[PDB]
Amino acid sequence: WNSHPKNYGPGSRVCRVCGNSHGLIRKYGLMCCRQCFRSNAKDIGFIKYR
Amino acid sequence: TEDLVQLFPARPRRRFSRGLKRKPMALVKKLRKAKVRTHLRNMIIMPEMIGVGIYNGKCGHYLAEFSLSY
């Protein structure tokens, strides 16, 4: 059971909101996929300026 | 087993210096007791067993040479 080392890689990190193993943004420790992160950009505080 | 890895190429030197897992000594014990059906191919060949068969995924070097799948 889970014998393979999951110390890194997409097998250990999932989107905090949805849970995808792809499109994971990690800058500033966001830990979420691009779709979910773009959905809640206003909620986080990410607002367009230019 | 120090002189052999000393004149072995760089990759065997580093890999053997980096340590070994349990399945390696399980394999060598099985081989010496039997004196070949495992899928593992990441054992750098030492002169111990000079004297085959690996699952290809469909049916001074590693065993990752004869594991041809297609």
Binding site: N2, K6, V14, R16, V17, G19 | -
Partner: protein, 82 residues
């Protein structure tokens, strides 16, 4: 799913004394975020009480949350025979 008596006792004590439940969907994490119980056991036990109307659920961002009712506390008293 098979559950030991002591583990179910510990889950019940946690549910009673601190009547708020949260969990993370990671059975590889062999310790529940507060109590040493593995996550799978408590999650499956709670899913067992789910159909029993004793607790109500809320799932947000891969996180289980469970909220208590009068039936839950009375079930805890009945099981513990307090």
């Amino acid at each position: 799913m098979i559950i030991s008596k002591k583990n179910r006792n510990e889950i019940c004590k946690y549910l009673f004394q601190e009547g708020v439940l949260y969990a993370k969907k990671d059975y590889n994490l062999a310790k529940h975020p507060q109590i040493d119980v593995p996550n799978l056991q408590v999650i499956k036990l709670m899913q067992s009480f789910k159909s029993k109307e004793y607790v109500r659920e809320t799932f947000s961002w891969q996180h289980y949350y469970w909220y208590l009712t009068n039936d839950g506390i009375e079930f805890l008293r009945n099981f513990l025979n307090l």
